[PDB]
């Protein structure tokens, strides 16, 4: 929540350089408040579809109920941090991050009024621009993002505020440590959902991811086309494992994330989202030791399209080299050090810095 | 020349709404440069520099956006078109009153499209 003050009568005239800046700055604040009020008035295809912010938005609907803001507003009267029990029974962290009401009501307007809409101290106008700036940028973000943003910017939630959110969340000490050392990822997996400007308070819901599975082993499967090496142009056959992507052990099964680009890797930790996963038996790993094993039917696609390509892996490069394409691996100090023969071959990242397949 | 909003007929025949959203030329030519030269090329009022930094700031932020977007942006940011300007554009557009009300209550969606 950000607490605002209603500005009733802006009766300032007088074209004076110092006066004009406060009047124009006050119009920015009023317009921003008004602007926010007008706002209320392969194998990826197997995956299901969720409603990413259904949880956060549902909390937002509860805040529109009668008296729901007064509970929040009264609980955040003495401190900037309080746990509020909502009408539906849900306990929610509340957080007053910016108090513009008291600044305008008790510090700015008295100073402003005293000298007949004239301010004899440039420092007071600037201090207001600094105070006002955050509310202006929150409005700026919500107006181009249609009231739901991701990632949660440092304007919506400063770094220190977010760390305080994490330390007060009902989660494990292991969980808190994980989120705290990776705030850049936590932001990227978070939503900020604008909510209400009711009473004298602006409130938005920040929907943070909670990581219920931590420290289980994960592996990334890279796959590439495997073709015959016949001399006749179209006499060739091709075969590719399609089960490429990320795999993590999870509650006795294996969570499979087909689109590996939706996962973020920081050092050796993989942050994935289970809404983009299929739940598979542990026996999926057998496809790596014996593709013809009888316990799991390993997925593949077949083609007659023998085109050359390369797949960069975590520790090397798979090279599918077919036809007359030139495929090599190079060192920074030595040039070309390996020329690939036709078929699927592999190179480690030890002696190799680049891999060249055709004009790529 | 006289107003900040006008309807212009182009050479090919299509009439297009026009809109002067920022007049930095006149600010510099008539208000800043005259103040500057008079007091022996020095400015004795800190409020004058800030007023210029504020007028200039939008032109700078527009430049940042076209410089990172190669001259075509979406959605239309509030630096390109402030909320009041966009509401004025919709209201002055040759469209239905059902259409104007729709666009005006959903400007955030009008930006995104």
């Amino acid at each position, epitope marked *: 929540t950000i607490e605002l003050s209603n500005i009733k009568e802006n009766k300032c005239n007088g*074209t004076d350089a110092k006066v004009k800046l406060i009047k124009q700055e006050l119009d920015k604040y009023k317009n921003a408040v008004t602007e926010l009020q007008l706002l209320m008035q392969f194998l990826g295809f197997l995956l299901g579809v969720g409603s990413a912010i259904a949880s956060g938005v549902a909390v937002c609907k509860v805040l529109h109920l009668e008296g729901e803001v007064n509970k929040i507003k009264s609980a955040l009267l003495s401190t900037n941090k309080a746990v509020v029990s909502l009408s539906n029974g849900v306990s929610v962290l509340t957080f007053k991050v910016l108090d513009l009401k008291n600044y305008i009501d008790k510090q700015l307007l008295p100073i402003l009024n005293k000298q007949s809409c004239s301010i004899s101290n440039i420092e007071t106008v600037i201090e207001f621009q600094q105070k006002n700036n955050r509310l202006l940028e929150i409005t700026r973000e919500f107006s181009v993002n249609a009231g739901v943003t991701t990632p949660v910017s440092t304007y919506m939630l400063t770094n220190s505020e977010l760390l305080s959110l994490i330390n007060d969340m009902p989660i494990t000490n292991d969980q808190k440590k994980l989120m705290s050392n990776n705030v850049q990822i936590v932001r990227q997996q978070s939503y900020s959902i604008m909510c209400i400007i009711k009473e004298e308070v602006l409130a938005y819901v920040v929907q943070l991811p909670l990581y219920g599975v931590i420290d289980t082993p994960c592996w990334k499967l890279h796959t590439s086309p495997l073709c015959t090496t016949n001399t006749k142009e179209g006499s060739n056959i091709c075969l590719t494992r399609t089960d490429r992507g990320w795999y993590c052990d999870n509650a006795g099964s294996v969570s499979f994330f087909p689109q590996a680009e939706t996962c973020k890797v920081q050092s050796n930790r993989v942050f994935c989202d289970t809404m983009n996963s299929l739940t598979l038996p542990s026996e999926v790993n057998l496809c790596n030791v014996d593709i013809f094993n009888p316990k799991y039917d390993c997925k593949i696609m077949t083609s007659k399209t023998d085109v050359s390509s390369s797949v960069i892996t975590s520790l090397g490069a798979i090279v599918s080299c077919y036809g007359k394409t030139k495929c090599t691996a190079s060192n920074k100090n030595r040039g070309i050090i390996k020329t690939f023969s036709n078929g699927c071959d592999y190179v480690s990242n030890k002696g190799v810095d680049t891999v060249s397949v055709g004009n790529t | 020349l006289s107003t900040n909003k006008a309807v212009v007929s182009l050479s090919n025949g299509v009439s297009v709404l026009t809109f002067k959203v920022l007049d930095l*030329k006149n600010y510099i030519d*008539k208000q800043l440069l005259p103040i500057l030269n008079k007091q022996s090329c020095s400015i004795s009022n800190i409020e004058t520099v800030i007023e210029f930094q504020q007028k200039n700031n939008r032109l700078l932020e527009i430049t940042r956006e076209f410089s990172v977007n190669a001259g075509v942006t979406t959605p239309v940011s509030t630096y390109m078109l402030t909320n009041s300007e966009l509401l004025s554009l919709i209201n002055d557009m040759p469209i239905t009153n059902d259409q104007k009300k729709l666009m005006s209550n959903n400007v955030q969606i009008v930006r995104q499209q």
Partner: antibody
Amino acid sequence: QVQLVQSGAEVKKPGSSVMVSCQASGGLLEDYIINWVRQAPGQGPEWMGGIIPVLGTVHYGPKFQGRVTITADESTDTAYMELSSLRSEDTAMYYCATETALVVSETYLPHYFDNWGQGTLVTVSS
Amino acid sequence: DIQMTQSPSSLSAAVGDRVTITCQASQDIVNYLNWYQQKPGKAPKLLIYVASNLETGVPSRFSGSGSGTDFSLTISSLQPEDVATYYCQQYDNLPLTFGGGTKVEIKR
């Protein structure tokens, strides 16, 4: 503290032309907008025109255009104003007045008059 | 041309009185407005430029105000040496124009 020193007062017959000079002492003409402002008896001052040597631009009022020529001879720091086809209305005090023009943009126009000459009283009479 | 309408045409006030002069333009001229003081027989003197900036060495009892179409010149404590004709002058567009003048007389 540039001083503007104008030519002497004189009488000119109707229909001929008059040239008023304005001597800048202490500065160059490149550094200023040089304006000419006249004042007829019992009337306010009237802007006749201005020259901006640093921009190579001359501007004349509609009431005088086509019968006023303003020149700036930068070799002697003297401003000149020729007013042809004199009439009785032209009997007036003709003032040379400059505006400091160091930081200049294109499309720069005269704005104010911060330093004035003493005035040249031209009487148009036979 | 832009017409400057200055009011009043003349006024008489005692030494120490507060005096205000009005300047109006025929159209919006933002705050591109100057004020001049002319004593009889002498050149005009620039008092106020760009609507409100005080020229160097002019006593602080002079002030300039206004924007848009309506402007004012305020003297907070009139002194004998202020007897003169005052002119406002706009520069929003050419040709530059002056007001009609306000003659200020001292009542003693």
